[PDB]
Design an enzyme around this catalytic site. Structure first.
Site, mmCIF file in Angstrom:
data_model
loop_
_atom_site.group_PDB
_atom_site.id
_atom_site.type_symbol
_atom_site.label_atom_id
_atom_site.label_comp_id
_atom_site.label_asym_id
_atom_site.label_seq_id
_atom_site.Cartn_x
_atom_site.Cartn_y
_atom_site.Cartn_z
ATOM 1 N N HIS A 1 3.183 -4.812 -8.618
ATOM 2 C CA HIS A 1 2.310 -4.484 -7.436
ATOM 3 C C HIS A 1 3.187 -3.697 -6.436
ATOM 4 C CE1 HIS A 1 -0.655 -5.133 -4.186
ATOM 5 N NE2 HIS A 1 0.378 -5.477 -3.431
ATOM 6 N N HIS B 1 -5.304 0.454 -16.608
ATOM 7 C CA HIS B 1 -4.029 0.326 -17.302
ATOM 8 C C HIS B 1 -3.936 -0.865 -18.277
ATOM 9 C CE1 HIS B 1 -1.901 3.357 -14.706
ATOM 10 N NE2 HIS B 1 -2.909 3.051 -13.911
ATOM 11 N N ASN C 1 2.914 6.819 -11.917
ATOM 12 C CA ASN C 1 2.163 7.455 -12.984
ATOM 13 C C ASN C 1 2.982 8.686 -13.447
ATOM 14 O OD1 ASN C 1 -0.061 5.726 -13.106
ATOM 15 N ND2 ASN C 1 -1.427 6.977 -11.818
HETATM 16 C C1 HDD Z 1 -7.050 0.087 -4.690
HETATM 17 C C2 HDD Z 1 -7.087 0.061 -6.046
HETATM 18 C C3 HDD Z 1 -5.993 0.885 -6.694
HETATM 19 C C4 HDD Z 1 -5.539 2.104 -6.346
HETATM 20 C C5 HDD Z 1 -6.097 3.076 -5.242
HETATM 21 C C6 HDD Z 1 -4.523 2.417 -7.327
HETATM 22 N N1 HDD Z 1 -4.332 1.288 -8.154
HETATM 23 FE FE1 HDD Z 1 -3.041 1.100 -9.643
HETATM 24 N N2 HDD Z 1 -3.925 -0.795 -10.208
HETATM 25 C C7 HDD Z 1 -4.843 -1.458 -9.431
HETATM 26 C C8 HDD Z 1 -5.447 -0.926 -8.289
HETATM 27 C C9 HDD Z 1 -5.275 0.351 -7.821
HETATM 28 C C10 HDD Z 1 -5.041 -2.797 -9.966
HETATM 29 C C11 HDD Z 1 -6.531 -3.194 -10.095
HETATM 30 O O1 HDD Z 1 -4.634 -3.794 -8.980
HETATM 31 C C12 HDD Z 1 -4.160 -2.903 -11.206
HETATM 32 C C13 HDD Z 1 -4.836 -3.339 -12.486
HETATM 33 C C14 HDD Z 1 -4.494 -4.793 -12.611
HETATM 34 C C15 HDD Z 1 -3.132 -4.899 -11.955
HETATM 35 O O2 HDD Z 1 -2.295 -5.828 -12.158
HETATM 36 O O3 HDD Z 1 -3.124 -3.861 -11.075
HETATM 37 C C16 HDD Z 1 -3.531 -1.565 -11.290
HETATM 38 C C17 HDD Z 1 -2.583 -1.161 -12.221
HETATM 39 C C18 HDD Z 1 -1.720 -0.076 -12.166
HETATM 40 C C19 HDD Z 1 -0.628 0.236 -13.120
HETATM 41 C C20 HDD Z 1 -0.262 -0.637 -14.336
HETATM 42 C C21 HDD Z 1 0.684 -1.765 -13.923
HETATM 43 C C22 HDD Z 1 0.971 -2.562 -15.170
HETATM 44 O O4 HDD Z 1 1.642 -1.955 -16.076
HETATM 45 O O5 HDD Z 1 0.602 -3.775 -15.273
HETATM 46 C C23 HDD Z 1 -0.041 1.360 -12.734
HETATM 47 C C24 HDD Z 1 1.146 2.126 -13.376
HETATM 48 C C25 HDD Z 1 -0.744 1.842 -11.536
HETATM 49 N N3 HDD Z 1 -1.759 0.951 -11.257
HETATM 50 C C26 HDD Z 1 -0.452 2.998 -10.890
HETATM 51 C C27 HDD Z 1 -1.161 3.546 -9.832
HETATM 52 C C28 HDD Z 1 -0.922 4.827 -9.139
HETATM 53 C C29 HDD Z 1 0.332 5.747 -9.316
HETATM 54 C C30 HDD Z 1 -1.821 4.939 -8.145
HETATM 55 C C31 HDD Z 1 -2.019 6.044 -7.087
HETATM 56 C C32 HDD Z 1 -0.995 6.803 -6.763
HETATM 57 C C33 HDD Z 1 -2.738 3.815 -8.244
HETATM 58 N N4 HDD Z 1 -2.277 2.977 -9.260
HETATM 59 C C34 HDD Z 1 -3.785 3.590 -7.377
#
Ligand code: HDD
Ligand code: HDD
Lengths: 726, 726
Positions: free
Chosen positions: B365, B101, B174
């Site tokens: 988060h 993202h 999402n």
């Molecule tokens: C275990 C790892 C993991 C998993 C399984 C998911 N995510 Fe995630 N996501 C992250 C690990 C992550 C992250 C690495 O922690 C991020 C990128 C950096 C951040 O700040 O968060 C992120 C970002 C992030 C963002 C952007 C937030 C922003 O605008 O800064 C969104 C909208 C989502 N995620 C949505 C989802 C959805 C709807 C998931 C499943 C239903 C999902 N993610 C599963």
């Protein structure tokens, strides 16, 4: 086992043309392409086949599909250290991108001089034609982030790290011979003006916005580089077909201590070539990795990028002999005044294994010089020396960035520096200071000398008061833009006109466009009028009456400034789309591919679907891509062979293919019934220059095609393209 | 004194339509818009007008144009601290982008529930219809870097930060109701597979490459979210016209201690609308910032993005009443079985002031919950909880990321945590630990309760062994992809076939395309055969006999899964191109604009150059952009008024504008002699649905055109487009 039975998952380890094989890490693609630097990286290369999946601590993983939970539908447990290690590494994968030049593509290769340069420089890597110096080269745009598109209009960087026996020399250059500004203190201002605007972070990869043109309009020193950017220089066809320049006057120092002023040049042995604006812009959408892909594929095909290193040499006594200051980085040295002496050849012959580890983490810095080279007082170069060291402390996480494998020298390095984050070297020296007695003063200083000596600066005389002041000799802004304008062909001039016109139309505040048009009237009235007319601006009397700036040392043009005035087109490594039908005349196709092969020109066979089609004689022809999947943007010419032309005659995508290629001035060849496509692009019965046509694809039809391809584009077609709806 | 005398450098501080004014920082554009969070940022906002230029230590700068040197042509001096502070800051501007993202666009707004939800949740922000909660929302793509293009095919993120009186709640969703994988342990595998491949870092912003489809073909659990991504859901028209979903089952907890399962929904009050693939791809080239620009411009115009929060609610005792597991995040809950209950409205009504400070540094988060919410054992959610805290330590430089102004709670926060990099809070508590007597044990724990109580987890029963094992109840992969497919209209099914066909054609290893086709055969035979044909693959007799998966709880479809089955278009905020000529009939134009204004539809006036043209009656018409400069891609419909048509009738760009809009299924309206353009798009004299035509623009030419825009695109035109060469 998940691989296919037939082994088709694994690309052959031999050179193959673009798209014949899946691309691969360079050591697996070309395992026997070696150089001292590639060999020295073997201690950190890590394989995979036949090894157990492990944590980073070497513990074998039994189940890499599931978290540890209480019950198979229960909560995940904190004691799952396998999950957490794997997720922690993932969570921390990214490092800051480069402040500028964040988008770039790199390869390994080697350099060798043509002859000993010991008469003018003691630099060990130029001392002997049999001395081979490994290099790592990164090409880049400037404005856009690491995720932006390749074929934007922008300056390009061209940075070469030389791993010499006497130190790393980094020659950190661009694809134009000057820069936008005079003094490093203004670099954050210029870079902020061109980058996405701060409230909303738009636009990416584009100078076409208010703040850039506002800065240019208030800082006429920028106009010279702005001319280069607005020409087709700003949109190269390939990193292989663009020039490179150090920008600044540096010095060579010989064994006697004589200094000679030098500017560095890279001359592309594949010749100079650029896209046209519509094609470039559309290509940022159809393939934003086009240059990155083209470079990696050229090396995998054995079409190694080759450049000749060139020096423009000016004796110390000649410092004041021009009507511009040699230390002004907004001024070029016309090759008509000081010729480029060709000094050696660099060949890029191996791709990296891992982009992040070798390309993203590579650190290039123009302060990285070796004995035999020195700096000058150019006030833009002077401030650069501060930045490229400083910036690595956050980007690469601390002061041991030289221990990152790609950055390491291949020659000895020993000193008294210690610690810092991720310290790799374990020092055994009892001493960490000098002078010391406890290690007999080792490692020891070395006096400067003719070879293997310590670095001593050239003892240039400095006389003046401590001042923040621009040299009066730098205060001339228009004559180099004009010299550049007058050296372009008429179609190059028309593209520069269109580049300013398009860009300025995207400036929302009209007074900025007007102020820019005023600056153009100080360069050339014909240019200023042409851009004004596209913006709906009328020049005032005052503006029609601005005296042109003077010629540069009596030059009214220098054709070395044009991409195209002097033909140097090379077709090896170019690509032709061949538009298939469901019963291709196998004889047309045999002759076509044979003639292309003879010249090292590649082909992609295109159809309305994937899979294969069958020729009249039963030859099975595999399809590389659809018409829509591999647009004419991505090829240098288009051939349509004979066969069942009715199969594709009514296909919108195949017709548009031809319209697009035609509009972008690409050669088109039509054999036998394929001539029915002349109707889609409005070609008279008697034919047109740049459209090759014949009853069949004989030997003559191919020679005609390949001659047109050597001239790159059909510039004579320009007045016919504005009627064309494509 | 560089501003123009007429003040035209400064955007009007009032709502204006896209393109009328330069865009500006939110607090300058809309100084009267406020909310509690915007008010609390006031202490860190920095102005500029009438201030001296200083160092960061507050020392006024005299000359910001030059470095300090010895003589005006001499070397730069190390003592120039003003130069080094300014270059140093520039040298360290960049911070690591988000692992995923990384590309996103954000705005401030507010949320208000329709009624108290206290019977089902004690969450304070849901407790009172008068209670207004500020929000900050960032929308994003997933795969590409921060400088990648907006209108890629990808999942989109929709993350909302609620600054509640009882904590920050982040709802991190999402634009589809599920995810690709079941267990968080696989997240780095899937993300590595979709991201640019590691040898060469290609392709950006695209799943169309071998590693993504290899993973998909080996992991059928992915097929549900792949179906969504391959449909037009993957290429939304605007962040305003897409759905949002929390994806997982969470819990609400009321004051009684009762838990109810919940899945979160956002409904776009502007309706659902997507691009078509050829238009989305080309648009990544013409304007890679199109969604970011559209969002910012809608807010500046007063077309505030509005979304209705909704809940799907399932009693605890209904956990096992479905054919699928409620905890399996690859499964959706069909709205036919559990309706969405409307909860409240969110309005985004202010842009940020500084993109980096507010957007790039924002940290969302999903573990950030408040009392009245709780988690479930969903094994992808479970692992998410670890990631979003961990990743901030490198992205945002340490554990004090909650003190970065955008991330700060507006409600009290006090505890015994201390220190850490860039610590802002200066603690005066004599104690940094509890229990303590020396500050009478403050700040103090608070028992759980109906309001303002401490957080206590719901006491779910856990029973089973410590295992790394997937629940058997998750082992069904095809029924939901099928339910999705059967719920789509035939033109939506066509676009899904074409998205699989296009992506798979870019997979170089054919066996991978075959393996994916074999997976589609397990979902639906028609889908599989249609993709197969496009790929030149023939299904085996065994593949042709795969029994389709069962329906989902008796459902043969659910129309709420389709973007278009149930019309819900809204024309407010859409845009029309009006193609001018040099003698426009002004009665036509008055009528056009008046009708568009009445429905809140914008207009951009386009010509072959910038400046102005004059109507038949002397009305001077300002030109917004050229035909090439603002392509049809960027608009919802095209109108060509009468006038001197011969002016533009043979203009290539003007003809192509219409052909491009025609191909992309946009409404086109032609008045009087502009009907001549019917020949270029091959329309018969008697006309066709989707092309509005008349002697003049009335009354009811505008009602017809606007009726067509309400339906978004002219789907019936599809059979006609293949012919057209555009
Ligand atoms: C275990 C790892 C993991 C998993 C399984 C998911 N995510 Fe995630 N996501 C992250 C690990 C992550 C992250 C690495 O922690 C991020 C990128 C950096 C951040 O700040 O968060 C992120 C970002 C992030 C963002 C952007 C937030 C922003 O605008 O800064 C969104 C909208 C989502 N995620 C949505 C989802 C959805 C709807 C998931 C499943 C239903 C999902 N993610 C599963
Ligand atoms: C004092 C500011 C400043 C000045 C005036 C310039 N640069 Fe620079 N440049 C930087 C500060 C910088 C930098 C911030 O230090 C970069 C970005 C990250 C890094 O590693 O170096 C960089 C990167 C960078 C790169 C990319 C190297 C790579 O691929 O990693 C190239 C090719 C150039 N520069 C070239 C030039 C040229 C030819 C200049 C004028 C003739 C110029 N720069 C002026």
């Amino acid at each position: 086992s998940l691989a296919p039975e037939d082994g088709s998952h694994r690309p052959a380890a031999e050179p193959t043309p673009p798209g014949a094989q899946p691309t691969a890490p360079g050591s697996l693609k070309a395992p026997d392409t070696r150089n001292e630097k590639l060999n020295s990286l073997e201690d950190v290369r890590k394989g995979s086949e036949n090894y157990a999946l492990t944590t980073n601590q070497g513990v074998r993983i039994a189940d890499d599909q599931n978290s540890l939970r209480a019950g198979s539908r229960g909560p995940t447990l904190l004691e799952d250290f396998i999950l957490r290690e794997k997720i922690t590494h993932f969570d921390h994968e990214r490092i800051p991108e480069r402040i500028v030049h964040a988008r770039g593509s790199a390869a390994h290769g080697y350099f060798q001089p043509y002859k000993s340069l010991s008469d003018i420089t003691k630099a060990d890597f130029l001392s002997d034609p049999n001395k081979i110096t490994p290099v790592f080269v990164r090409f880049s745009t400037v404005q856009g982030g690491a995720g932006s598109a390749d074929t934007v209009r922008d300056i390009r960087g061209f940075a070469t790290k030389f791993y010499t026996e006497e130190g790393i020399f980094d020659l950190v250059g661009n694809n134009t011979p000057i820069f936008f500004i005079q003094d490093a203190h203004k670099f954050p201002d210029f870079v902020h003006a061109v980058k996405p605007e701060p409230h909303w972070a738009i636009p990416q990869g584009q100078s076409a916005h208010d703040t850039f043109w506002d800065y240019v309009s208030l800082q006429p020193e920028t106009l010279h580089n702005v001319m280069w950017a607005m020409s087709d220089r700003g949109i190269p066809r390939s990193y292989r077909t663009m020039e490179g320049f150090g920008g600044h006057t540096f010095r060579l120092i010989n064994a006697e201590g004589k200094a000679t002023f030098v500017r560095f040049h890279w001359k592309p042995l594949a010749g100079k070539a650029s896209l046209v604006w519509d094609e470039a812009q559309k290509l940022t959408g159809r393939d934003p990795d086009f240059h990155r892909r083209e470079l990696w594929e050229a090396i995998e095909a054995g079409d190694f990028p080759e450049y000749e290193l060139g020096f423009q040499l000016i004796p110390e006594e000649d410092e004041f002999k021009f009507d511009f200051d040699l230390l002004d980085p907004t001024k070029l040295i016309p090759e008509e005044l000081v010729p480029v002496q060709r000094v050696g050849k660099m060949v890029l012959n191996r791709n990296p294994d891992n982009f992040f580890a070798e390309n993203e983490q590579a650190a290039f810095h123009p302060g990285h010089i070796v004995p035999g080279l020195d700096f000058t007082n150019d006030p833009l170069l002077q401030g650069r020396l501060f930045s490229y060291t400083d910036t690595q402390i956050s980007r690469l996480g601390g002061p041991n960035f030289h221990e990152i494998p790609i950055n390491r020298p291949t020659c000895p390095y020993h000193n008294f520096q210690r610690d810092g984050m991720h310290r790799m070297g374990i020092d055994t020296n009892p001493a960490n200071y000098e002078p010391n007695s406890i290690n007999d003063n080792w490692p020891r200083e070395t006096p400067p000398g003719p070879k293997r000596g310590g670095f001593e600066s050239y003892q240039e005389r400095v006389e003046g008061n401590k001042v923040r002041e621009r040299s009066p000799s730098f205060g001339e802004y228009y004559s180099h833009p004009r010299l550049f304008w007058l050296s372009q062909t008429p179609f190059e001039q028309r593209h520069i006109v269109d580049g300013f016109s398009f860009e300025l139309s995207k400036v929302v505040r009209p007074y900025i466009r007007e102020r820019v048009v005023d600056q153009l009237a100080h360069i050339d009235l014909t240019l200023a009028q042409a851009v004004a007319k596209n913006l709906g601006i009328e020049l005032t009397d005052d503006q029609l009456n601005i005296t042109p700036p003077p010629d540069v040392n009596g030059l009214k043009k220098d054709p070395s400034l044009s991409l195209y005035a002097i033909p140097d087109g090379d077709v090896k490594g170019r690509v032709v789309a061949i538009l298939l039908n469901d019963e291709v005349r196998s004889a047309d196709l045999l002759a076509i591919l044979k003639a292309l092969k003879a010249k090292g020109v590649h082909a992609k066979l295109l159809y309305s679907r994937m899979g294969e089609v069958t020729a009249d004689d039963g030859t099975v022809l595999p399809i590389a891509a659809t018409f829509a999947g591999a647009p004419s943007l991505t090829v240098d010419a288009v051939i349509v062979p004979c066969g069942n032309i009715a199969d594709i005659a009514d296909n919108g995508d195949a017709n548009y293919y031809l319209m697009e290629a035609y509009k972008h001035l690409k050669p088109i060849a039509l054999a036998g019934d394929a001539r029915k496509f002349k109707a889609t692009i409005k070609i008279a019965d008697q034919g047109e220059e740049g459209i090759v046509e014949a009853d069949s694809a004989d030997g003559s039809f191919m020679d005609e095609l390949l001659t047109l391809m050597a001239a790159h584009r059909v510039w004579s077609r320009i007045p016919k393209i504005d009627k064309i709806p494509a």
